[model samples]
Target chain A: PKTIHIQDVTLRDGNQALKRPWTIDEKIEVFDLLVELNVDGIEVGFPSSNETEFHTCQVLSKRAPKGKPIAALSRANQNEIAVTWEAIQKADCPRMHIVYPVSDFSIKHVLKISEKEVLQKIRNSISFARSIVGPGIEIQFSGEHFGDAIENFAFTKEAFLTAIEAGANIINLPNTVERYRPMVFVNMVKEIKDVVKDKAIISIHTHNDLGMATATSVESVYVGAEQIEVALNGLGERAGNTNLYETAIALHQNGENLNINFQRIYPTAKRISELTGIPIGEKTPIIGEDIFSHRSGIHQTLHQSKGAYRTFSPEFVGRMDKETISFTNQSGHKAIEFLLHQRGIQVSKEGIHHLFSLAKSISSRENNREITEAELVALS
Target chain B: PKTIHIQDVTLRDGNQALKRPWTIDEKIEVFDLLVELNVDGIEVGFPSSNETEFHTCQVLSKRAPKGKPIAALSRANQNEIAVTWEAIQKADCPRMHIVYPVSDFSIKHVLKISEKEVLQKIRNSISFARSIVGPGIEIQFSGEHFGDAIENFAFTKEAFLTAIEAGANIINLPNTVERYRPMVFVNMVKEIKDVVKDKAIISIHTHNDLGMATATSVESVYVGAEQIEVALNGLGERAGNTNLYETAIALHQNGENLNINFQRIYPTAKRISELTGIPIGEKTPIIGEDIFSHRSGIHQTLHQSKGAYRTFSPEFVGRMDKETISFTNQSGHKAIEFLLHQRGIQVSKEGIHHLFSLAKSISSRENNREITEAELVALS
Candidate 1:
């Protein structure tokens, strides 16, 4: 019974990436949605950075239900880690999420710190965070820019081992910047999983810089990563984070056992998009408007038979738009039949033929707007 | 020495799926763009379907230059095949593309044909197409709904073998409805490739109903498929086709050699979106508004130095947006320092700290819109 845990970062990562940060009430509403979905983990915010985020985390932490840990972010320092814990201490399962730059480029150039010092920071921070939370609460450590750390594997490995030894149980490996194919990161994840064994749960958090975050995250699970960090509708900095709907659906399609309420996916996606003021693209994977729509000749014909054009039924995700067929010049007679059926009228074969011919004749005359029932009946 | 061919179907699959079909003028304009990109094959719309489509194919076929074949689709019948050739025969290299339902569900229910009858149709139609096209023109056969044909593998393989035997040089397998993980289709691609080794140019055409179309297409290439059928902005039916930009970039990132003009990606995406009236999502993979826009502290800081947050530089895809940074309450002092550096004025540590403090204090008071340069300078 292999199970994957979805750790949603919509409030934390998604809010931070937004032009306007989510308010405390908005965060709590999203929190309620996640709780209703029974999300494995909810990253409330990076408490140390902003007073609003800190207060939001504290408010959300109190409402964080059992079994669903609320994680808060902090830098790899005692003060930040302590501040993070102070914000989320009252939660049922508060996760002290600590991050440190692990790649040579990020460590040496960005942080201007040596590899040895980076490991020391991880050790001290994880130990400090663990000491504050004691044995019951969760302490998750993230190796930021882990995707670029492949060239510096030995030190990256050492840092993860150090964080694990210092009492961090969930070691998050983020492709802080996604530059390579999913397998490149997946192979690295395999190596780290082998090295860490069962001492710590490997968490895969990916940014969609390369547009393969869901693929990368899903591939990681097949190899060994147990937890996936995701945001609703793939909302985050730059390109965005791995999309929650795409990842969960991909995993489900792959027969991976997960705890996500699949039915809540559509409504949640619409809600998040509304809140963030970002419109979901018509072609976005599972939640897009076109995801379940059928058009064209063969498609409508097959769709009328047994939902042939659908990957999954719309009802599976609670999408109300079912067998919604529209006709273009390329649409076949099957669309006319489907439309007539919708009116609960059984037309003769000759009537179907006449309507099909009329549709073709009219489509040639006018621009290809959908063949509405008004026009269909008027043509007949 | 390995090279992959991109067969763009935006004109065919995309136009058919649109609410309004493209006019001959629009088709020609898009054809000119595909030619500029030097795409390997252009799948023009099915010529036998409608008058506009037939006229568009005829016009595009005439304009088709050397080394670029224009493919037009037909059903598995002599008349449709003849009509397809009649429309496209004037091209430099015309491809007669034929499709037949291969999945048991499609064959038994939708197509309502026996397995033996389907094989006979494949043989007769392919033979008839070859007889018409003769030696020089390309003849491509597609086993439609190939993804669902896995349960009936023996018959599917037999159908492909019959198509090949009847003089089809390219066997295009379509995941007409993407229902399963990519590897399920990929493994089937590998199997078909192994069985039909060196005999036919195996083509992979996938739909994005599951959103892993690019990943599925790329993985198929590693195993055996040589040609990837893609559409601009993934414009096809039901969540669209495998995105041309995404598949091309993914292949390029994997170090696969291809004949695409990479610099045209952004322009083409924008042009297609404009033509189709489908607004590209802000968070769309490589060719979106927010792809290079950096927000959040770590992202902005990393973006300033060597473009760390970007997987590939925006310029790689001819995108003009570069190093765009916005600030919220969660932003660090580095953003303040970077803003000062942008003004070509060096700021002291105390000055940077004061601005950072002021930015945070103001963000707390107001909703988190970006801190502008005017405000940054005013505080100084």
Candidate 2:
């Protein structure tokens, strides 16, 4: 029954994992798609890290979408914060998002700082960003490696509250390493939310390291986290971030009060898949090619006579098209005969079986690729 | 922290989705691999449905792993149940698994049964099986569409309770369609666990309709479900079931309290992949060829220098090798020249850049597939 806001990070986090960097034009196109999809906020990019990215962020800020804020990513440092602020200063709505690692390994080795110094760094960095960016400019602090940080829960919560006190409007707890299950993450968010309820909007960022990113994000939202940062198609560093479409659809279908327009989901998925060149697998969740296709005889028969076996109607997710029939060696004589008749070449059951045997022999040699209609008829 | 048992159905559920069935010899090989993996139980096949599968199940029951249980699947009827029970009666440990649809449409249309009738049928079938098989026998019941069935919670719970009371030792809730988020499943399992606490062993059988089968299965376990019914490589009807290896590794890494042994997971995954002739996708979680391989410069640098960015060590999941450097189109001049030097073909930085550009152009035309070392030498 709680409200959760969807944050789009395809431009910032998604682009970071891409081998072929998006040009400014391409970046803007993705931003437009984000706006069209009606996400609450868009993290444009880490402007402080690269010149081209900085210019892209500046342009996106100047031409930011209506009703949706543009945010920039930065490390918890003065230099990165300054550059991030400079790029987003002209935007109608801007957010300066800063993050620092809080795990023992990150605090001791990566930052070369003691726990107290790490807390001080977060406090100083957030305060500085708030001062320069001025009022109305939002500040978000990401608790990097928060999943691992849960081992020392007291320190992690201390760091989170310090950032909130310093001026962070949003507190992000990321599953930096996607090596754990959803309950581990849900318990962490519940601990943080229990202590800091409404002090700052709680957001979650999860990677797909062990492929629990989407699950962890969903559970985090269920445990009262208000915001979810996700990448289009789950693209990001390593195995990628939580997939935006999956998270949205999951919430829409499961959450008691969450209402999302499911119709636009497929179009949004297709655009992201196209821009990223990561071909959507045929069996990918909602928008996969074969999600609605019934191949097995029992399923197909049930589907045709009753349509009882299907959970959600394919039309609900833009899969309303009739199931694509595939001719394979394992296909039964009934399916084979039905296909042959559809092609206007009626065959007896015996004839169909004979043709099927020949087609199977050739397809078996072709490494089990589906037989073409022409190939099937030729065998007949 | 609870112990979870995995019931692998690769031979039964997995083969049902295959385009071509594995031979008896191949099925025996798979049985051997499942034994080697030491999974708690293996679903041999649906002995009541197909003659070939019945004989295969009989043979596997007689020659199964020491101390491991062998299970046979059947539709929810006395005839099919008796067939499966007879086939597996000789096994060291035997289970007769039965499934029936409980969704509104499945009951009204697929089975042409009233709500009360379906519940009575469940009671009758489970009791009938128990009367013959007795208490020592493991009787598993599957609510075929538990995800959607939960939308009508009272009926689903009634059916579950009926099966449990009728001597069903294990109640399997199947996400027959992976059309929603993992939390949708987690919530269902949580609610079921609240009512069915210690009444019966709760098992989750998820399909990969939306590519969240493994995540859903793992989350079901996290939410207090004790058993996972899975197929290797997530192979089942439509998209497939949860991949046994993915689920095992996920549990091993995150559910240390669950106490799963992951050493044999890779070999088990490989054997299933070979037997089924389903080439595991390069991007499949944990056991995929590229799950641990880093190709991007930033990732490679982080992996080599820090290893902080990685979640689970590659060795933890049986990926013992580092990423082989790729010198394809995306490679920089330094990377290209390094590959050339490895082949004893030295070149200047300027020349390397030119050669890299030429190779990049050629490889781009060829759809970004890798260029061989010989091709690089020829280009030079």
Candidate 3:
């Protein structure tokens, strides 16, 4: 099995989607949690973007999470590259991530530059940054809309290989806007991998525009990408980025024998969701409160009687126990009996049926709303 | 292109997720809207579950769309299936959907029966129901836990084949307990397609336990499933089922040649969300307000300059307009200038900077909330 490094981007890309600003202190607190989760590297922030971001990156580079590599985000411009390099220069391990749009749409509309000009800018910016930062510092380039770039695969691969040749130790293929399915991305990654051929460690950075970011990221890994750029709780611009907890758990479950330590995923996910003010969807994978919950009586019964209905134990993702009972119109006498048992009461089969009938009446009036505890007690 | 049918379960499956109940009139309003949207079918309720559900299904069936089919859900048992069939028989186009667990887990623990016994029950129950109702009635079978059932591919295939042979016109596969990812489902559908070999029209019924319900449903279609089971605003048990509008737009955007009617998607989505009291997430795909709106300066600039950055035009999904710019972050000079221009207060670059500085101080003090027009005027 290949060892895949997980890059934590909670501080940089994750903060981009925040509706409220976080203090440098808050950023450091979250950074410490990422370290505890054993993420390979932390992308601190774009120093060139703002003073608050720069200060957060600088402070983390200087003091927080010793021995954990820190990288800073920047555009593929000399000034942005230099600023990011200076902010992370004091760290034990530091990298400068320069992103540039390669797709025709991004080149023509976003940058308003020709393909030739874009290539020249990449060469000059990367070379100059390497010269200033020296040979020791890691340099990474992100293909801004790599999935879209697949239409012109040859040109996209050339841009990635050029970045690698120009001192980029890691090349990231980001699905800038996740508007399609996972297969679209897996095919793109396969094309890039065929050309790069172990020249640089490939990473996947997927967005959740169509909500396939986690799946696409996992598929990229299965098809040979080594690193996953993820934000805790899937926080990023618009919909958000790939969820770190989901990715880790997926790799562990599907990749079988892949030694990804995922026990700390839930804590890391919770802290990020809390601090960022990004409400994690209750149905969010792995760490979501309801992911392990079963409301259907039959599903609950099967889950409880033999744990037979579960794909993986919720405990594996920090959730404990399974439910054998739920109150609903469809809930049978057996489920009602189980609920009664939980409340420390015993009932005859006929009594259980009467209680279920009463519960069903309430559920009918309430459009299948759960029976209230008071209602249950009244029946008792 | 083959014409596929969309069966919406918003009123039945979607109502399961709501904290409050919709009035009978509200249910009628949604049913009328479903007619306007031209959805092929609507699952009114699980009538056999209780009296209210039964009454509601009967009322909906009476006043249902003139030519469109109205379906009622029931468990695969004599009593439940009989009640559902009786209720929907009055509709202009009535379909009875019989669901039963086919997985080993559901058989052994949930039903507390052997595999052979469960299969026999499905065969006998469905055959009896079909014979009683006769040919004009469409009998559908939902393979509960079909995604997990794929692990025991041979048994899952055998059960589906049996149901199809037993006069089930439509075979529905459910991602029963949405756990981690869509690939878990996509792979299951691909394998099922190999076995079923188009003997029955395949349908995908998903629950949004992981919030990827829409994605999984759309991908299921790409993997050869023809019919789609969806709810408005993706509402159902736990997280919910796939949102109808999202799944339609996903296929429209990516599966262009699939030839689905997309004109009524957005309005239908909004109506369902409002009626059901299930607020669609701002980040939900396709129908989400933010899906097509660009906020970042780079994205906004590209959108304005050439509209080249967009993959699918917002107009295509019924959101034709651009995002309303909010002057919240004081550092956004472009936004501030744009707002100033709107008020007919022209300013030089230096004047813009001065106004920006004042706005920054005010915004920072207010914790970066959007500045009112009055506040902007006061800064000027």
Candidate 4:
């Protein structure tokens, strides 16, 4: 009976890495799309970055739907925490996200602070975040660089306990930079989820520097992470964050009860890509151009029957296109026969071979293109 | 101390699905590049499909390196098995890869054969393949659509044992179409690996239909799979196979001793992309164009020091470019200062702010592009 929530960070983390950050109006457009997506929450923006960012968060907060948390991000500092809360307090459900480096290496080298002081900062920041947002608003604490914290799990454990003790109810662990396989990271997540049992909602944020973000994020849910942090089209810094559609579809296949609007997935992905100017690869998982296309001989033959060459039907994710069985030189006569049968034309074995050779010759020309059903019909 | 062997399947699976399958010369070019890559195995081509395919395999067989496998694929039929061995017999390490459908659904619906008939075919075809190769060449058996075989794992186990007993030394389980999470597939792999302990070498081939191919393939190694099958730039049918660079890098990070030449990874990826006409996404994992570039303020600041925002160095993957700190409106003053310091120009705190504002204004123009160091220096 667990209802896993997917929190989208497209407007915050995804927008920050774009060549041209989304304008305030564009952010509202993305927010509206996500609203129609019925995501559990949306991290609107880092409100304390500047006045424009602050105003954007304020606008999004006012427009947020009921029961959908409008979250604003800030560093683990009192001034930034106060500004973040102020920007998002008008929402029906406002959440304050405070991030601090929790790794011993990051504290010693990056932040140049002792682990003890970092823990003190975690305590003070969550307490301050709680005071500013009051008891009604959720204060979420993120332990940045938690992937590296595996070297010193005891300190990271104490840090999470400190945040929970100081009134934070949501703890997000980020593999800020992925450097290991999904199992290693998921093991760490499982250990931490066990440590904070029932005290806080465990959330996971993974980066794809090593290209394991979707796997890490999806696998974390199986290990007790309640909230999955993802972005549309996997948009974020570096290789990008875990893809929203990939994570959702994988979870759906794994039989996890999720809140995502499956029918809106494809449309939402297209809109995000068009607006962000980040073109989705033709082979990108779940939303790619050719994801539903089968071209090889054996694959095309197997795909004539449903679910033989597909994980799920295209309609499950709002894909309007049927599974395309295009013909190439490597495609078998089964694909040709299937296309012909669709046109109500059943040919003899010799006729099928003749058409197959014709299709191959046309498809393998210098100007190579997949032979369409129309072409196959013409040959027949 | 187990060494996981990485097999490049670009020539076989990748070529078959292209809009235009590679010609004999193009196949040779790709095979030679893979030879320099020093991968443990290369699946040369599906030999029984046609004369052109059979000749490509024959050509690649003669050119294969010592102690490296040159594999040819065929259906689980006697004639196809003979053609497959005839094509790869000249290889230094010739391998005949025979595929059969083991899933009960596939056998009944797709192949229209009974379980008994399917097992008889697996035994007869592989035994015929071994007789032709005469114990010198390795015969690998692949259970097609094994992801769905999880429903009838006992039958799948029996099918693998039948192939092993018929003189197949390698058993490959392919998530022919990815339907479940990595854990489900990896668990199935572990079960089969345990069942076939020391009887045959366990291998894994996973497609990226769900974008979990790298995770599934890498985790299979931990669960006793000895060989990982991959394609360059993740090229194959549908969403393609597990990416070679992504799998190798993940395995390298997970402390698995692999036999890949990590230094040739980037160059090999580019060549494959150039020849295959499959474009690598800017946000593609590992070898992406912008993967090593830092854009956001927080990331740029963290990236000022080494290993903060990166999993590994660029040089490890043969990437010649150093980490780039390009400037956008979201970039911090630290990035500007870092760029200036690299140029040996010292600026005051006030001068830094002026340069920061100037850089932000220009990057935010209607004609937006990332600010280069030369532009930042001019503003300074």
Tens-digit lDDT string for candidate 4 (A9-116): 999889888877888889999999998998899999998988888999999999999888888889988888888888998999999899998887888877898778
Q: Highest TM-score: which candidate?
A: 4
The per-prediction tally of clashing pairs is 0, 2, 0, 0
Which candidate has the top score in DockQ?
4
Candidates arranged by TM-score, highest first: 4, 1, 3, 2
List candidate 3 stretches off by more than 4 Å.
Answer: A109-117, A255-274, A281-293, A296-380, B17-23, B108-119, B179-181, B257-279, B286-349, B354-380
Per-residue lDDT tens digits of candidate 4, residues B1-380? 88788888999888887877899999999998888888889999998888888888999999887888889889888888887888988888998899988886788787897787888999999888888889667889999989888667899999999999999999999988888889999999999988999999999999998889999998899889999899888998788999889998888887878778899999988888889777777888888887776656542244454467778888899988665455664455777777778999989888887888787787778486577777677875
Quote the positional error of residue B124 for candidate 1 in Å: 2.5
Per-residue C-alpha lDDT of model 1 across residues A1-380, encoded as one tens digit per residue: 56799999988888887877777788888899888776789999988887777898899999988767889999888888888899999888888898888998888777897888887888888998888889977789899899999678888889999999999899999988777777778889999998999999999999886667887888899778999999998988777888898888888887888889999999988998889889988788888886565557642244463366676777788788655454543445667777788878789988887778777776777775456777786665
Residue B31 of model 2, lDDT score = 81
What is the TM-score of each predicted model, taking all chains together? 0.87, 0.81, 0.83, 0.90
* DockQ each: 0.48, 0.30, 0.30, 0.57
- Give the C-alpha miss distance for residue A93 in model 2, angstroms: 2.1
Model 4 spans with C-alpha error above 4 angstroms: A298-306, A322-380, B298-306, B322-380
What lDDT is obtained when candidate 2 is compared to the true structure?
0.78
lDDT of 3 by residue, A251-325 (tens): 775653333456676766677667865555555556756555555333224445236434467666666665445
- In model 1, which regions exceed 4 Å deviation? A111-117, A298-306, A322-380, B111-117, B298-306, B322-380
Question: What TM-score would chain A of each candidate receive against the reference chain A?
Answer: 0.87, 0.83, 0.83, 0.88
Docking class of 3: acceptable
Question: Model 1 chain B — which ten-residue stretch has the worst lDDT?
Answer: B297-306
Q: lDDT per model, in order? A: 0.84, 0.78, 0.74, 0.85
